[PDB]
């Protein structure tokens, strides 16, 4: 019966592929022919933020476009004023091997975790005026790889145990588990109309998950190696992904397929991080080659480059008003660009 | 602008306090030699020194040794956390799982992010290797056919009273990891082999001696003397 179920899975995958081919009118590159190119984007480092003793391994920006969080494998989690360069907090951690961090959309809380296979949440607005662990979300059976708040009560996590989970932070328990990935889940992105999220996972796949129903609407499989990075396009109808196969790729939700791939044979590096600019028109990506490429999302031209780091660009992010890019790296510095 | 000046003063005081803390923590971080500990389930890695953590000090030098215990068998993402450790300690049960140990060693050695990290190689359970070649059906010849053509190095040191067959088997298994490490070391990283068995206390000295050699060879490379 295992061969009959595997053969029916081949029949279903061939049927899904034919259903996608029925939808496949033209490559986005042809649709956008009349659109004017972006031309040479010039962005310059407007700040360097320094103070981490070891490789910065993660980021998130605040909804205020003003504070940001970064984590490093010395066991520090620093919160910065990006306008003034001042460190606002510098949280010590129980386990030094952090692999992600996040900042609640209110700015009231920060989350992080890594090889401890725990997500630890920190309150920034305590009555005692001090940062401390509000809760530890233990229960993942492999490293925490990404996490992201919906609000001050709800957090989505991603794990080396090949699952995502939704937690209620007061409860301290998994409100749902999302289980269908076959490799280590690497990264998350939440929808702007926050009812859906996407993940990519050390297999060629990205999945679109329904937050309320608890199981994936769609599986996207066009990549060629481990998806490290994922991000929604700003309307929530499409997403980018970057992987060890050195391509970024743009996927629709609504057409259930790739629209475009972003590459050069000049690039043989895994992609660590991806984000759009506010209009969606630029797709920014960080690479193992120590720099970032800025892509026209509608063309696949390299509209520019950000190149300020002595070691791997580990993380990247655009402010909620689009006013800057931040990038972190294994040399321990953040750069902010505009 | 006094409303701004009040907040600037508050951020300046916060920043300067945080920088005082980060300076003291920079001393604790730099004083401490982080190590990653690896091996199969049969490898006695839990008994080499006398995540899971193990802090020890030798001659006033702090070694902090990490074992990634409670995680999945596929490792290519979590292993990247250790690109900045001072050494990898790699532990092998001498016995057939030796080929699994060699393929694991090869993948640790050739990884893009581990290219700069020296390996301290503990070939453990040498008492079991000794008795299981003093008796038993020479099965090392069947697992590794090159053990017909191999013979001991003339720079090999026997321990007092070990039989030449034990020396032959010891130094053969040792030299396979030397074949793997020599093939691509590029002077950027080195392999430090030691023979050991579960009763040894001297392993704690051996890790300190090899961390001297790692940091010496790093300084000699930096000044173009290697």
């Amino acid at each position: 019966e295992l061969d009959q179920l595997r053969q029916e899975a081949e029949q279903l995958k061939n049927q899904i592929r034919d259903a996608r081919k029925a939808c496949a009118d033209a490559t986005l590159s042809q649709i956008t022919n009349n659109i004017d190119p972006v031309g040479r984007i010039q962005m310059r480092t407007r700040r360097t933020l320094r103070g981490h003793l070891a490789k910065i391994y993660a980021m998130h920006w605040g909804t205020d476009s003003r504070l940001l969080v970064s984590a490093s494998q010395d066991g520090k989690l620093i919160i910065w004023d990006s306008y003034t360069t001042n460190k606002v907090h510098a949280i010590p951690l129980r386990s030094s091997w952090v692999m992600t961090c996040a900042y609640a959309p209110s700015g009231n809380y920060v989350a992080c975790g890594g090889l401890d296979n725990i997500c630890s949440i920190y309150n920034l607005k305590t009555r005692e005026g001090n940062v401390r662990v509000s809760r530890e979300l233990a229960g993942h059976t492999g490293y925490l790889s990404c996490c992201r708040f919906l609000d001050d009560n709800q957090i989505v996590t991603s794990s080396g145990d090949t699952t995502c989970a939704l937690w209620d932070i007061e409860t301290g328990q998994q409100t749902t588990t999302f289980t269908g990935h076959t490799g280590d889940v690497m990264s998350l992105s939440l929808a702007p109309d926050t009812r859906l999220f996407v993940s990519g996972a050390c297999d060629a796949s990205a999945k679109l998950w329904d937050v309320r129903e608890g199981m994936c609407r769609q599986t996207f499989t066009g990549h060629e190696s481990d998806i490290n990075a994922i991000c929604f396009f700003p309307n929530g109808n499409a997403f980018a992904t970057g992987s060890d196969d050195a391509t970024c790729r743009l996927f629709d939700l609504r057409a259930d397929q790739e629209l475009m791939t972003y590459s050069h044979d000049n690039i043989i590096c895994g992609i660590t991080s991806v984000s759009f600019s506010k209009s969606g028109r630029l797709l920014l990506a960080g690479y193992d080659d120590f720099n970032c490429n800025v892509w026209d999302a509608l063309k696949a031209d390299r509209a520019g480059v950000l190149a300020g780091h002595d070691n791997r660009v580990s993380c990247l992010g655009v402010t909620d008003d689009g006013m800057a890019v931040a990038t972190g790296s294994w040399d321990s510095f953040l750069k902010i660009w505009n | 602008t006094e409303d701004q000046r009040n907040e600037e003063k508050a951020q300046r005081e916060a920043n300067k306090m945080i920088e005082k803390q980060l300076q003291k923590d920079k001393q604790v971080y730099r004083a401490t030699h982080r190590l990653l500990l690896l091996g199969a389930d049969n490898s006695g890695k839990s008994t080499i020194v006398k995540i899971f953590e193990t802090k020890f000090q030798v001659d006033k030098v702090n070694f902090h040794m990490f074992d990634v215990g409670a995680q999945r068998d596929e490792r290519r993402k979590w292993i990247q956390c250790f690109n900045d450790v001072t050494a990898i300690i790699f532990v092998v049960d001498s016995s057939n799982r030796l080929q699994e140990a060699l393929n694991d060693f090869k993948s640790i050695w050739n990884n893009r992010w581990l290219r700069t990290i020296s390996v301290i190689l503990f070939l453990n359970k040498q008492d079991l290797l000794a008795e299981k070649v003093l008796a038993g059906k020479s099965k090392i010849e069947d697992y590794f056919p090159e053990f017909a053509r191999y013979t001991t190095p003339e720079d090999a040191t026997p321990e007092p009273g070990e039989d030449p067959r034990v020396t032959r088997a010891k130094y053969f298994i040792r030299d396979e990891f030397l074949r793997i490490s020599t093939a691509s070391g590029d002077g950027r990283h080195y392999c430090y082999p030691h023979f050991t068995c579960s009763v040894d206390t001297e392993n704690a000295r051996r890790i300190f001696n090899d961390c001297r050699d790692i940091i010496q060879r790093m300084h000699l490379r930096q000044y173009e003397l290697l």
Partner: nanobody, 128 residues
Framework: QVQLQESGGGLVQPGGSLRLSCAAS????????MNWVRQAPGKGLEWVSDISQSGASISYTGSVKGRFTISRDNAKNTLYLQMNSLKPEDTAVYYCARCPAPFTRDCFDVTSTTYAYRGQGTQVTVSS
């Protein structure tokens, strides 16, 4: 979609010979070092052999040196294992596995119990 299908297998006599085949799709096969791994009944996965991107560098387990030969076709997107002088001890499912990232010599997870970049495998049974 990254996939590998193995072909060749079934029962064969001890002392015999058999060529395994693997066909790839969803990747530019030339960029990947590629592998055979095997699982004997009731026992763990073990590594059998490697071939590099160019086919110039190759390797085998000590049980297998001379007895099996690995080869590849970067224009057909296929990997092969020609097997000679089979022992009863070679009785296993054989899997075509790929190194995870393109352009490198490390291949950590090709022997891992679950792994994304191997085929379904084919049975090879060595008996009368």
């Amino acid at each position: 979609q990254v996939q590998l299908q193995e072909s060749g297998g079934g029962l064969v006599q001890p002392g015999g010979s058999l060529r395994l085949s693997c066909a790839a799709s969803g990747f530019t096969f030339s960029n990947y070092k590629m592998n055979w791994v095997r699982q004997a009944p009731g026992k763990g996965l073990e590594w059998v052999s490697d071939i590099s991107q160019s086919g110039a560098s190759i390797s085998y387990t000590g049980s297998v040196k001379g007895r099996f030969t690995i080869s590849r076709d970067n224009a057909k997107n296929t990997l092969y294992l020609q097997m000679n002088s089979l022992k009863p001890e070679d009785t296993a499912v054989y899997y075509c596995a790929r190194c995870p990232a393109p352009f490198t010599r490390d291949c950590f997870d090709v022997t891992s119990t679950t792994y994304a970049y191997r085929g379904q495998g084919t049975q090879v049974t060595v008996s009368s």
